[PDB]
């Protein structure tokens, strides 16, 4: 059977969907999978995630040396270089696969891991990309080499939004974070990765037709140097695994009553914003379950990570006033289970794509609160095109004040404002089931890829 090697770039939001993808490959397609894990140190959260059928093994590479990098290095530079600098160790793993008679049939990287294609090419292994965010942002990535060549200003200076075929228009000032400073190595690494996308034999994207129909149709049209694109989503943890205290609390709340609040694996708010969010959550008088992290002036400061107790940053009396109706859990919650719980009724999200897809699969409507990466692009898609998220108004200083927090929370949970988004999520919840049935469009697309891999292995071995 074909052996698929998967090399994630750092980040829980890369590993989680890749593990769901691997599980479908082994269970539904009979393939074998090895994760090759690059990094800086032992896995965190990560181990809970990698802890799987026998058909899935994990190899942890020796940690890469990133000690030459400035403390102010942006995350995408760190993420990309973790994979690039791991190539010599990845080659050693591939030599071990050759010796064991299990040369991979495919090497799957994620959106920042394209330098591992060097190893794939050396070993005559087809390179693929598993793209863990939207077809809209994939379109942006595929177009970036051309955009870079044709546009010479910082993107925030663009007066017209970018309107790629089938895509929601996005202002230059809202392009993903690593695109916002073209002089920084984060842009250099983003651009470099995008220029390698044309080398992929296929790109599997964690989205589905009904969610992004116009962008998927455009991506699948033949184009210059464009690989085949396969929507295979939503590949998520559906939340049926046994976790505890926050779920026990949830069990005691009415159907559809609780607002879950979470800023992904890496997100933090500023002090001032943390304060206004807490105050506005209390003011709203809604039930809530908030995964809290200590504040920072850097929005993705927890990406790789807490020492301090986040509860110490809450305002006077907040924990007291919300002792019954709010549950505040530091650092990490069993998010899949929360979103699948019948007592959950809404989600204030940073618009990371895994969180969005988990919410879609359970029909939970959103308040879009983007922080870093491509989240603002996702917020525009969710609120202006898909229409499954409400957005809070930030003042000219960037702060969402407590009055606005309370307004949008009540709008989502009880208001006329939230009816449209709740209905759209109901329809998307159905569609998410449709596309994953045996002859649903996402199952068909993944099956085409697995069939290609089975054919390739058959030809090689005969
Ligand atoms: O407290 C938390 C926060 C995050 N997650 C999971 O971590 C992933 C976060 O990925 P996402 O794409 O939403 O954002 P990122 O962390 O990459 O910014 C999702 O699968 C979440 O369910 C979780 O289980 N508990």
Q: Residue 199: which of 146, 137, 125 has the closest Cα?
A: 125
User: What is the position in ligand 1's atom list of the atom closest to the CA of 335?
Assistant: 24
What's the reported resolution, in angstroms, to a tenth? 1.5
Cβ atoms of residues 37 and 43 within 8 Å: yes
The three-state secondary structure class of 109 is strand
Q: How far is the CA of 44 from the centre of ligand 1 (A)?
A: 14
Tokens 């699969």 belong to residue: 361
Tokens 């990406």 belong to residue: 303
Tokens 């609390």 belong to residue: 249
The three-state secondary structure class of 269 is coil
Question: Which residues pair with residue 291 across a beta bridge?
Answer: 329
Distance CA 40, CA 62 (A): 8
- The per-residue DSSP string of 308-338 comes to S-GGGGSPTTHHHHTTTTEEEEES---HHHH
- Cα–Cα separations (whole angstroms), residue 437 to 28, 204, 448: 12, 18, 15
Residue 50 CA from chain centroid, whole number: 17
Distance CA 399, CA 270 (A): 9
Distance CA 26, CA 387 (A): 35
Domains of the chain: 1-233+438-462 (3.40.50.2000), 244-437 (3.40.50.2000)
The three-state secondary structure class of 456 is helix
Q: How far is the CA of 459 from the centre of ligand 1 (A)?
A: 40
Selecting among 3, 29, 51, 110, the annotated active-site residue is: 110
Distance CA 401, CA 353 (A): 25
- Cα–Cα separations (whole angstroms), residue 306 to 37, 80, 266, 292, 313: 23, 24, 11, 11, 13
List CB contacts of 185: < 8 A, sequence separation 6 or more.
Answer: 73, 74, 77
- State the binding site for UDP-alpha-D-glucose: 265, 332-333, 350, 353-355, 358, 372, 374-375
Q: How far is the CA of 358 from the centre of ligand 1 (A)?
A: 9
C-beta of 335 in contact with ligand 1 (< 6 A): yes
List CB contacts of 320: < 8 A, sequence separation 6 or more.
Answer: none
Q: How far is the CA of 265 from the centre of ligand 1 (A)?
A: 5
Token couple for 155: 């993107």
Is 397 catalytic? The answer is no
**Dihedral angle at the C-alpha atoms of 196, 197, 202, 204, nearest 10 degrees?**
130
Task: Give nearest CA residue, ligand 1 atom 21.
Answer: 355
Tell me 411's DSSP state.
H
- State the binding site: 265, 332-333, 350, 353-355, 358, 372, 374-375
C-beta of 261 in contact with ligand 1 (< 6 A): no
- Cα–Cα separations (whole angstroms), residue 333 to 78, 290, 317, 329, 330: 26, 9, 23, 7, 8
Is 305 catalytic? The answer is no
The three-state secondary structure class of 67 is coil
Q: Residue 393: which of 411, 416, 377 has the closest Cα?
A: 411
Q: How buried is 184 (Cβ within 10 angstroms: 0-12 exposed, 13-18 middle, 19+ buried)?
A: middle
Experimental technique of record: X-ray
Cβ atoms of residues 274 and 313 within 8 Å: yes
- Cα–Cα separations (whole angstroms), residue 73 to 231, 298, 371: 32, 12, 18
Q: Residue 11: which of 331, 334, 268, 304 has the closest Cα?
A: 304
- Cα–Cα separations (whole angstroms), residue 63 to 60, 102, 174, 283, 434: 8, 24, 34, 47, 42
Peptide bond into 319 cis (omega under 30): no
- Please report which residue ranges of 352-391 form alpha helices under DSSP H: 353-361, 375-380
Distance CA 433, CA 444 (A): 14
Q: Residue 389: which of 372, 374, 377 has the closest Cα?
A: 377
**Cα torsion angle, 45, 51, 53, 56, sign:** positive
Task: Give nearest CA residue, ligand 1 atom 10.
Answer: 13
Distance CA 240, CA 340 (A): 8
Task: Give nearest CA residue, ligand 1 atom 8.
Answer: 13
Q: How buried is 247 (Cβ within 10 angstroms: 0-12 exposed, 13-18 middle, 19+ buried)?
A: middle
Cβ atoms of residues 241 and 326 within 8 Å: no
Task: Give nearest CA residue, ligand 1 atom 7.
Answer: 265
Cβ atoms of residues 304 and 63 within 8 Å: no
User: What is the position in ligand 1's atom list of the atom closest to the CA of 351?
Assistant: 13
- The per-residue DSSP string of 211-239 comes to TSHHHHHHHHS--TTPPPEEE-------S
């Amino acid at each position: 059977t074909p052996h698929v090697a998967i090399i994630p770039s750092p980040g829980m939001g890369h590993l989680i969907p890749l593990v769901e993808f691997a599980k479908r490959l082994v269970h539904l397609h009979g393939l074998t999978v090895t994760f090759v894990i690059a990094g800086e140190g032992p896995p965190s959260a990560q181990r809970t995630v990698l802890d799987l059928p026998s058909s899935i093994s994990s190899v942890f590479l020796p940690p890469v040396d990133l000690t030459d990098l400035s403390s102010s290095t942006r995350i995408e530079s760190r993420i990309s270089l973790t994979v690039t600098r791991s190539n010599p160790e990845l080659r050693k793993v591939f030599d071990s696969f050759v010796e064991g008679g299990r040369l991979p049939t495919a090497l799957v990287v994620d959106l920042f891991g394209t330098d591992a294609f060097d190893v794939a090419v050396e070993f005559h292994v087809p390179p693929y990309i598993f793209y863990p965010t939207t077809a809209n942002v994939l379109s942006f990535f595929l177009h970036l080499p051309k955009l870079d060549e044709t546009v010479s200003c910082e993107f925030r200076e663009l007066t017209e939004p970018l309107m790629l075929p089938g895509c929601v228009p996005v202002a230059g000032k809202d392009f993903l974070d690593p695109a916002q400073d073209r002089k920084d190595d984060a842009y250099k690494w983003l651009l470099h990765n995008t220029k390698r996308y044309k080398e992929a034999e296929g790109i599997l994207v964690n989205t589905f037709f009904e969610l992004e129909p116009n962008a998927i149709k455009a991506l699948q049209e033949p184009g210059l140097d464009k690989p085949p694109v396969y929507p295979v989503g939503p590949l998520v943890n559906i939340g049926k695994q046994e976790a505890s205290e926050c779920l026990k609390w949830l069990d005691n709340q009415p159907l559809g009553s609780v607002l879950y609040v979470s800023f992904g694996s890496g997100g933090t708010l500023t002090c001032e914003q943390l304060n206004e969010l807490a105050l506005g959550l209390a003011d709203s008088e809604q039930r809530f379950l908030w995964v809290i992290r200590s504040p920072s002036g850097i929005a993705n400061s927890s990406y790789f990570d807490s020492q301090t107790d986040p509860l110490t940053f809450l305002p006077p009396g907040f924990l007291e006033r919300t002792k019954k109706r709010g549950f505040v859990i530091p650092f990490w919650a069993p998010q899949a289970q929360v979103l699948a719980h019948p007592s959950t009724g809404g989600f204030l999200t940073h618009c990371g794509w895994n969180s969005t897809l988990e919410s879609v699969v359970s029909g939970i409507p959103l308040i879009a609160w983007p922080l870093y990466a491509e989240q603002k692009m996702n917020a525009v898609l969710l609120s202006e095109d898909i229409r499954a998220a409400l957005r809070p108004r930030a003042g000219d200083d960037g702060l969402v004040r407590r009055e606005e927090v309370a307004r949008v929370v009540k709008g989502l949970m009880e208001g006329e404002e939230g009816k449209g988004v709740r209905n759209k999520m109901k329809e998307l919840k159905e569609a998410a089931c449709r596309v994953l049935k045996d002859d649903g469009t996402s199952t068909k697309a993944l099956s085409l890829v697995a069939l290609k891999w089975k054919a390739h292995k058959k030809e090689l071995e005969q």
